[PDB]
Amino acid sequence: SGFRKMAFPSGKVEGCMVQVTCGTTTLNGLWLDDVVYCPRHVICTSEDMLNPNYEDLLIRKSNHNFLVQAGNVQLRVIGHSMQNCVLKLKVDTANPKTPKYKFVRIQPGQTFSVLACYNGSPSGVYQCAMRPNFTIKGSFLNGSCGSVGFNIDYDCVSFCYMHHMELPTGVHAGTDLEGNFYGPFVDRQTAQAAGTDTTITVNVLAWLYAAVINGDRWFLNRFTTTLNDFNLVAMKYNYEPLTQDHVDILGPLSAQTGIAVLDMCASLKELLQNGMNGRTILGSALLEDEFTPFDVVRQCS
Amino acid sequence: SGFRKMAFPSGKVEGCMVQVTCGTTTLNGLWLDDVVYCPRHVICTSEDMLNPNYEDLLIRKSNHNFLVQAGNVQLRVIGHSMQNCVLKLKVDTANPKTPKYKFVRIQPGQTFSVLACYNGSPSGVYQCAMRPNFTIKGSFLNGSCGSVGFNIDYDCVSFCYMHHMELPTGVHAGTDLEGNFYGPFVDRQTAQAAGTDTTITVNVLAWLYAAVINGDRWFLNRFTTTLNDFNLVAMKYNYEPLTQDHVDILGPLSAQTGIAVLDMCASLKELLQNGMNGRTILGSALLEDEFTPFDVVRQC
Ligand SMILES: O=C(O)c1cncc(C#CCC2CCCCC2)c1
Ligand SMILES: [Mg+2]
């Protein structure tokens, strides 16, 4: 029993973190076969960050301006190029610990594990969700840029995030491994803000099922509702709309517990309208929305 | 910024996870150098659960009754011995992936990472604290026994926990890697219930300091308290007594924020009396007690 925010084992990704230095800027890179991936803003100075011309700043640079350190070894850069907001440094040596991997882009609401690193050195792992506003509530300090997010599906690591920047409200923004930003952000020092966030409704429902599986039942009631009726309640409380696709995904938990999704939505309706009345659910006073249905099934079964 | 329950990177421990089988029972073992450590109840059958006589069960075993599997490879057992509640199996290959490591017995309130495993394959990593009642609030399914808890200092892994069983309230009990149980528990199916749990006060204080560091001050007040008056109040909310040791431990975080320890204690007293009136602290609507003073310094 028990339910914890759980990250994937990080060993396969630990074997790929390197330190990348360009001038004064030092940050983290991802070393897979003979290429090191890192944020292109590693080439920027303080003057450059205000309005960088990346194609221009790069063409003036050359291989030897990139110091790549894998643990105690120096890797020598034999080539460099850009893909979107990611810098790709071809190196002389393939990483012998390259795991089976894919680059995937995740959808808001989906979860992944983050290996936080400093100076190419992994320091911690935690689980988070891509928010509806495309930010992540991470925990990062200076030098975390180029830390990566990932899922593991079957010895295969699916790399989905690379950290680029912190926003003024303390949350974080980054790209997929092809350099495409999540959300309407740019890698430049300008005024950027997270949009108003919303709650991931399908994930809250999943977590309620987790709580039922773990013996927490007080919020269940005799009522059901409809998709239309509930989605009016969701809109009112800044929850994402619940779609039919969401209901189908939850299908397994609805079977395995005997509470149907609209049955469970009725509980969530009630929790939203009346609160928790001093009680908790899985040790939380808040409705938790960073567990997917899949997260719940994998951890609970 | 931000503040996350953050675990240690698990790779160094993943390279030591193996599967141990005896009879029909399979669970996880920890492979370090030429020794595999696992819970000794791997040698129990159904009939043995209530009053196992481990010495009698073990003396009937030979090396080749223990199957150890590291990934695809069978390891050959060449010796075995029991130390307290762990079995130590000597194997014919030293683990090439053995990290720098030590065994440490931790005190209640200390935190660590757990690498949950099934069949010697790691499933997930999360962060735990040793509760004051010597249990841990884990996430473990059948087959996770022998999963381990650890901290990593620089590159040395300090193993501090091995999972043995789930108590009836859904919390978990285990040993250090010398096989001594944390708490009053035994590897026996008997009525044993965890002590009433309490909140780890020194950790709550450390996390309140964390909140100040990340720029949040709404919960402070203009009062202070004596240590004894604070403890008289906090034990009415089932908080652990705060000792002078704890006051000393918090000294550094006090200096970094400019808030004396007993002033933060006064703030905690008021939080317990008032709740948070719809506010949150570092994103939580409860007082968080699974971050230690040391954890806060490391993550902030
Ligand atoms: O792990 C298994 O599958 C398994 C299978 N048969 C017997 C046992 C046992 C035992 C003695 C104590 C161990 C700790 C709490 C329960 C009782 C365990
Ligand atoms: Mg209902």
Q: What is the DSSP string of B60-81?
A: T--GGGEEEEETTEEEPEEEEE
Residue B147 contacts residue B115 (beta carbons within 8 Å): yes
**Left, alpha or beta for B276 (phi > 0: left; psi -120 to 50: alpha)?**
alpha
**Which H/E stretch holds residue A265?**
helix A261-274
**Left, alpha or beta for A109 (phi > 0: left; psi -120 to 50: alpha)?**
left
d(CA B245, CA B108): 14
Looking at the partner chain, which of A2, A6, A126 has a beta carbon nearest the beta carbon of B170? A2
Residue B246 phi, psi dihedral angles, 5° rounding: -65, -40
Residues preceding discontinuities in chain A at C–N > 2.5 Å?
none
What residues does B75 pair with on adjacent strands? B68
B224 lines ligand 1 (CB under 6 A): no
B145 lines ligand 1 (CB under 6 A): yes
What residues does B158 pair with on adjacent strands? B102, B151
Contacts of A20 (CB under 8 A, 6+ apart): A26, A27, A28, A29, A36, A38, A42, A66, A67, A68, A69, A89, A120, A146
Closest CA to A7 of A291, A284, A249, A261: A291
Residue B159 contacts residue B175 (beta carbons within 8 Å): no
**Which H/E stretch holds residue A11?**
helix A11-14
Rg of chain A taking only CA atoms, in angstroms: 22
- B126–A7 CB contact, under 8 Å: yes
Look-up: residue for tokens 């400019």? B258
- Report CA-CA distances (Å) from A174 to A84, A159, A162, A194: 12, 13, 5, 12
Q: Residue A118: closest CA among chain B residues belongs to which residue?
A: B299
What residues does A4 pair with on adjacent strands? none
**Number of the ligand 1 atom closest to the C-alpha atom of B25:** 3
Residue B153 contacts residue B298 (beta carbons within 8 Å): no
Look-up: residue for tokens 């891509």? A130
Look-up: residue for tokens 């995030």? A161
CA distance A254 to chain B (A): 21
CA distance B64 to chain A (A): 30
Closest CA to B130 of B96, B173, B93: B173
Instruction: Tell me how many residue pairs between chain A and chain B have CB atoms under 8 A apart.
Output: 115
Residue B131 phi, psi dihedral angles, 5° rounding: -65, 155
What sign does the CA torsion over B210, B212, B215, B216 have? positive
Residue B10 contacts residue A125 (beta carbons within 8 Å): yes
B173 lines ligand 1 (CB under 6 A): no
DSSP annotation of B40: G
C-alpha triplet A262, A226, A268: angle, nearest 5°: 45
End-to-end CA distance of chain A: 10
C-alpha triplet B225, B228, B230: angle, nearest 5°: 50
Residues of chain B contacting residue A14, judged by C-beta atoms under 8 Å apart = 9, 11
Residue B79 contacts residue B65 (beta carbons within 8 Å): no
Look-up: residue for tokens 């959808």? A107
Residue A16 contacts residue A154 (beta carbons within 8 Å): no
Look-up: residue for tokens 């795991």? A99
Closest CA to B299 of A118, A139, A148: A139
d(CA A224, CA A229): 10
**Which H/E stretch holds residue B166?**
strand B156-166
What residues does A163 pair with on adjacent strands? A174
Q: Exposure string (b/e) for B13-50, b if CB count within 10 Å is 16 or more?
A: bbbbbbbbbbeebbbbbbbbebbbbbbbbbbbeeebee
Asked if A145 is an active-site residue, the reply is yes
How was this structure obtained? X-ray
Say which amino acid occupies B212.
Answer: V
Q: Which of residues 207-226 of A touch B (CB under 8 A)?
A: 214-215
Closest CA to A92 of A119, A72, A117, A70: A70
Asked if A265 is an active-site residue, the reply is no
* Active-site residue identified among B22, B38, B44, B145: B145
Residue A123 contacts residue A116 (beta carbons within 8 Å): yes
Q: Is B277 on the interface with A (CB under 8 A)?
A: no
d(CA B155, CA B148): 17
C-alpha triplet A110, B122, B162: angle, nearest 5°: 125
d(CA A230, CA A109): 19
Residue A230 contacts residue A239 (beta carbons within 8 Å): no
Q: How many CB atoms lie within 10 A of CB B199?
A: 18
DSSP annotation of A218: T
**Number of the ligand 1 atom closest to the C-alpha atom of B52:** 11
Resolution (A): 1.7
Tokens encoding A66? 């990139």
Domains assigned to chain A: 1-14+100-197 (2.40.10.10), 15-99 (2.40.10.10), 198-301 (1.10.1840.10)
> Where does chain B have alpha helices with state H?
11-14, 54-59, 201-213, 227-234, 244-257, 261-274, 293-299
d(CA B78, CA B221): 64
d(CA B89, CA B34): 8
